[PDB]
């Protein structure tokens, strides 16, 4: 069974089309997870800002200082979440390019089935990532609205 050279590529490229699809799956999941965690944190800070707004003028200086310090610590938590967010989105972009050009390699080998499977996986991860991007952006917009209401009531009082 002296294998030709074409069957070696047709079998070989399936390795990377499954492996960069594995990287694309783990980056996509972890990015979705980090987005969801950051979205939950943003919703929590949004709730804190609304509660702080609703409590304005009903607390003394010490309680205002305590709630402000909690908000500052939550801001630092957002900064760390945003840093891991940017690194995760960077690695997911790198994985997207990895699986795209890997499936291109599968196309040029004639092993089109592994290529199309990788392709469908790229579109699936792109839609899932963009979906949870939209959810994160909605949470950020709600946080901005809560902050604007907080500033308006603080200035009003």
The residues of the shown chain that bind its own copies, judged by CB under 8 A, are 5-6, 8-9, 11-13, 15-16, 19-20, 22-23, 26-27, 29-31, 33-34, 84, 87-88, 90-91, 94-95, 97-98, 101-102, 104-105, 108-109
Q: What is the token pair recorded at 135?
A: 């959810």
For residues 51 and 63, what is the distance between their CA atoms, to the nearest angstrom?
13
Asked if 100 interacts with another protein (CB under 8 A), we say no
Asked if 26 interacts with another protein (CB under 8 A), we say yes
For residues 53 and 49, what is the distance between their CA atoms, to the nearest angstrom?
6
Tell me the C-alpha to C-alpha distance, in Å, between residue 117 and each of 1, 17, 18, 113, 114.
29, 8, 9, 6, 5
Q: Contacts with another protein in 36-55 (CB under 8 A)?
A: 36
Minimal distance, residue 50 CB to its own copies, in Å: 28
């Amino acid at each position: 069974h002296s294998l030709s050279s074409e069957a070696l590529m047709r079998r070989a490229v399936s390795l990377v089309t499954d492996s960069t699809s594995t990287f694309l799956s783990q980056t996509t999941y972890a990015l979705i997870e980090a987005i969801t965690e950051y979205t939950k944190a943003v919703y929590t800070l949004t709730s804190l800002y609304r509660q702080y707004t609703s409590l304005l003028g009903k607390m003394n200086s010490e309680e205002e200082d305590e709630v402000w310090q909690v908000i500052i610590g939550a801001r630092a938590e957002m900064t760390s979440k945003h840093q891991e967010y940017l690194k995760l989105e960077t690695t997911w972009m790198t994985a997207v390019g990895l699986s795209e050009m890997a499936a291109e390699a599968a196309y040029q080998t004639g092993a089109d089935q592994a290529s199309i499977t990788a392709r469908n996986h790229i579109q699936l991860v792109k839609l899932q990532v963009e979906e949870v991007h939209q959810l994160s952006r909605k949470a950020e917009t709600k946080l901005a609205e809560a902050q604007i209401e907080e500033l308006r009531q603080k200035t009003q009082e």
